[PDB]
């Protein structure tokens with residue numbers, strides 16, 4: 331068995347290997363990459379996403395989100411308070427202000443210590459989930475706006491044509507902006523490109539151990555667990571590496587820098603934080619190997635998780651028994 335310890339693997343494809351996206355994902359899996367739940371891909375030196383980032387300041391962040399924490403430093407939830415619209419130039423100036431800017435630090439490990447010590451005492455503002463793309467239309471390789479769609483994958487594997495579309499999303503971050511513990515909708519893959527700015531630190535649980543994280547989460551968030559049998563779908567809970575180690579949960583960590591891709595694999599729980607002002611692009615995708623994960627994915631039916639239009643058909647075709655209850659949650 332390849333990668334039996336479930337370590338995060340790092341890949342360096344050549345320009346020739348960067349042509350065929352599907353084939354390269356399947357290669358990474360032949361080497362055991364999926365067992366970690368997360369992989370890093372460093373693009374060939376010949377490649378670029380676009381020519382410059384000098385002209386992005388007029389993008390609008392219609393609903394910036396203030397991430398307010400509750401709990402203790404290592405075990406907390408966050409709620410998202412909606413703020414007034416602002417441009418990316420306005421948001422960058424806010425990120426760099428004395429109130430929000432990255433503190434002085436020695437290295438990534440010192441900044442990680444500071445994050446876990448102090449995150450709950452501040453409320454950073456995140457521009458999340460903004461439909462759009464920063465890839466140039468002439469970038470042919472690993473262009474996250476030109477991937478094969480999940481609807482086409484389902485149709486190719488299973489024969490059923492379905493409605494829905496699959497487009498990328500932009501994220502503008504600042505120091506301490508946080509992504510809570512989650513798997514993707516319908517336990518899909520994700521791919522994330524860090525276009526510019528400061529790093530993003532990731533934590534991940536191997537897919538084969540995801541239920542260990544769920545059992546810990548039920549113990550640490552007992553009211554939330556009573557409210558919903560899949561409350562991590564709400565994407566609000568944080569648990570620190572120190573707490574995971576104290577409870578014997580297998581995990582790994584890695585820092586993504588500008589110019590690098592990360593892939594998350596089906597049922598790979600992940601969480602993390604941004605080091606300073608940055609911009610990332612991400613999209614969900616599928617392969618043949620995903621179908622069985624999609625058929626088994628948990629679902630939130632309490633009404634909190636509220637998701638995209640295109641998840642309807644995935645539940646309807648892959649999980650017809652659960653469809654009626656899930657849809658009640660959506661209405």
Ligand SMILES: O=C(O)CNC(=O)C(=O)O
Pocket residue numbers: 501508509520521522530594600610612613
């Ligand atoms: O970058 C972020 O805030 C969150 N991204 C992801 O969870 C992802 O790409 O799957």
Ligand SMILES: [Mg+2]
Pocket residue numbers: 385386387388389
């Ligand atoms: Mg602009």
Ligand code: NI
Pocket residue numbers: 512513514520594600
């Ligand atoms: Ni994710």
Ligand SMILES: [Zn+2]
Pocket residue numbers: 557558559560561563564630631632633634635
């Ligand atoms: Zn729920």
